RNA sequence: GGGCUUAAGUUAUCCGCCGAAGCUGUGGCAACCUGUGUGGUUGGGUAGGGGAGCGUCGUGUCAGUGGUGAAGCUGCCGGGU
């Protein structure tokens, strides 16, 4: 029973050819170019859905911060006011306040003013 | 009027009519469901402590299950051999928010 | 009235042929040989 | 379960009765054993005359194709290695046998258990014996017809000049006709109903009886 | 006895087997998993071997 | 690295925050243990061991299907760990 292989064995090579198609050079036209970079892009794209947390995080707190520093208040100090106060509001949240409603975002820069420790 | 509600920790910035793509829940389409506030903003008034957070009531309904985008793991590590297929649904919950009541 | 196309083997009864040499998701590559030595091609005699 | 039932001889309408002896055709139908037997039984019909040519034996290749060293080629041996165009064939089919040594006790016993499985499920028909006289087709055709369905087992037995009936069922393409010291499991499974001669049943028990 | 209250603050990775051995012993399987134990001395034995990873209370 | 002594240097001390795929929250999957209503533990991995599968070709049987268009090839829209 002779089998010939090119019916199954261009099944992964349309895979990767589709995976690959917005690829510069040989990595959008040959399999074997196309397979190396979905290697990389495989472990890039799983690296960055985990980094993605970070970054955005980051972008809320600087966000905060400059909200905040208008304010008379950095960061840290907000936050521990925050905490203190007892509001879990979460950097996110606090972001979308502070591009959007500058004045409940100024409404709780009070209230951390007010629960800070004054020490 | 909008609320800053929790479900399934994670937050939202809802509001009366509002769509929101809630982590899934055991409660079934047409149901409805409320959402913990964690903050109530009506206009240059701003409720924020527990004791009237607790007052506050955000009523939402659900609409159905949706599935999110299909994500396809590949674990590779060169000059081993390794590799790991790998995908994900993670299949949510629509909610629509039907009032804020104080 | 069992016909043809009921006969079916004990569960257990016919286990599947292990193929060797078909790529890194089974015993690929090396054959479940390791890497040289007499042992990567032939086999080494039980009297020595 | 080692019952003996009694079927009723036909001839078209109705004639004398015929005893099924129970400790066969009344026993269990153990389907792993039925299924071994059959699959040894088709293995045995298979042929496998097929070959390929190895390295050694394919034409020509006896020389290296050039020097080991200096050209830039692949180092090379022959013309028909295995992963030259045109080379021998590594681990090809070759000619074998697959027949396999199924113990007696076995084989008989799925022949029982086959039988048995029909004849509890009234699938036995005996007659006295189709056709008379000369030879027709047409005839057992409706002999059959009337017993039940089309796809069908017919057991005749008389090896050497049982040809009106060996001869009239021949030709009908959905009955399959055996002698019964030939019933083998393959075939019981395969008919939907069995019709015995007089003689073929006779003869079947007289051959295996307790 | 006081049961005391024992937490994991540090990871197992890089310590000593015996470091390691000890904090099964005690049921502490992640950084920031508490036990209570009695205050028997074996148990004390075992905070103070892995005093260093862990912190006690009463 | 920019720049820094008007410390953004060293040091003691206090109050905050940032910070990982660690921990926690939420949703899905899986292996194992356990009395079997619960729950617990676990799931980085090369050589390598064990287990369960996908796809191709041939073929017994049954059910079929095909010029009202099979195979193959090639789009789109979807599905599964
Ligand atoms: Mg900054
Ligand atoms: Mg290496
Ligand atoms: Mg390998
Ligand atoms: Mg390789
Ligand atoms: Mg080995
Ligand atoms: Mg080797
Ligand atoms: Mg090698
Ligand atoms: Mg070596
Ligand atoms: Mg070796
Ligand atoms: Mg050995
Ligand atoms: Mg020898
Ligand atoms: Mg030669
Ligand atoms: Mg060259
Ligand atoms: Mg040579
Ligand atoms: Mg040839
Ligand atoms: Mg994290
Ligand atoms: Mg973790
Ligand atoms: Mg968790
Ligand atoms: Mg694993
Ligand atoms: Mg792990
Ligand atoms: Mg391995
Ligand atoms: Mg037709
Ligand atoms: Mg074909």
Redesign the interface.
């Known amino acids: 029973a002779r089998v010939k292989r090119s019916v199954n064995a261009k099944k992964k090579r349309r895979e990767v050819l589709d995976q690959a198609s917005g690829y510069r050079g040989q990595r959008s036209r040959l399999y074997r170019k196309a397979k190396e970079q979905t290697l990389h892009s495989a472990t890039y794209s799983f690296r960055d859905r985990r980094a993605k947390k970070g970054d955005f995080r980051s972008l809320w707190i600087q966000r905060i911060n400059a909200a905040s520093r208008a304010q008379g208040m950095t960061y840290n100090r907000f936050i521990n006011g925050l905490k203190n106060a007892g509001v879990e509001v979460d950097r996110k949240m606090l972001a979308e306040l502070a591009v959007s409603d500058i004045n409940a975002f100024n409404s709780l820069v009070e209230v951390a003013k007010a629960s800070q420790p004054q020490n | 009027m909008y609320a800053?509600v929790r479900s399934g920790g994670r937050?939202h910035?809802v509001a009366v009519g509002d769509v929101v793509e809630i982590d899934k829940v055991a409660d079934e389409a047409g149901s409805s469901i409320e959402l913990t506030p964690?903050?109530v903003?009506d206009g240059?008034s701003?409720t924020?402590?527990?004791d009237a957070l607790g007052k506050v009531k955000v009523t939402a309904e659900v609409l159905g299950e949706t599935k999110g985008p299909k994500?396809?793991?590949?674990?590779?590590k060169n000059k081993t051999?390794?590799?790991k297929r790998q995908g994900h649904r993670q299949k949510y919950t629509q909610v629509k928010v039907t009032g804020i009541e104080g | 009235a069992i016909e043809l196309h009921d006969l079916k083997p004990a569960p257990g009864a016919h286990k599947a042929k292990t193929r060797v040499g078909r790529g890194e998701g089974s015993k690929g590559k090396t054959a479940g040989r390791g890497t040289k030595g007499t042992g990567a091609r032939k086999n080494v005699p039980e009297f020595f | 379960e080692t019952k003996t039932i009694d079927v009723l001889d036909v001839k078209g309408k109705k004639a004398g009765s015929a005893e099924l002896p129970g400790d066969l055709f009344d026993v269990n139908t153990n389907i792993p054993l039925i299924h071994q037997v059959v699959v040894a039984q088709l293995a045995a019909a298979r042929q496998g005359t097929h070959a390929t040519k190895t390295r050694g034996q394919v034409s020509g290749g006896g020389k290296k194709p050039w020097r080991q060293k200096g050209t830039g080629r692949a180092r090379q041996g022959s013309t028909r290695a295995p992963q030259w165009v045109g080379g021998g064939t590594v681990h090809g089919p070759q000619p074998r046998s697959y027949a396999q040594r199924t113990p007696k006790k076995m084989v008989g016993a799925a022949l029982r258990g086959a039988l048995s499985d029909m004849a509890r499920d009234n699938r036995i028909f005996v007659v006295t014996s189709l056709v008379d006289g000369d030879k027709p087709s047409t005839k057992q055709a409706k002999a059959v017809l009337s017993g039940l369905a089309e796809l069908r087992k017919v057991l005749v037995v008389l090896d050497r000049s049982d040809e009106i009936d060996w001869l009239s069922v021949r030709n009908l393409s959905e009955v399959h006709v055996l002698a019964a010291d030939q019933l083998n499991t393959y075939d019981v499974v395969n008919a939907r109903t069995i019709v015995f001669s007089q003689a073929g049943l006779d003869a079947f028990v007289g051959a295996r009886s307790a | 006895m006081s049961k005391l209250k024992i937490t994991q603050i540090k990871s197992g990775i890089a310590t000593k087997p015996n470091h390691r051995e000890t904090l099964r012993s005690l049921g502490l399987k992640r950084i920031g998993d508490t036990v209570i134990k009695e205050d028997r001395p074996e148990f004390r034995g075992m905070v103070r071997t892995v005093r260093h990873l862990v912190t006690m209370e009463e």
């Open positions: 800053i937050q910035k964690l903050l903003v240059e701003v924020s402590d527990k994500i396809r793991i590949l674990k590779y051999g390794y590799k």
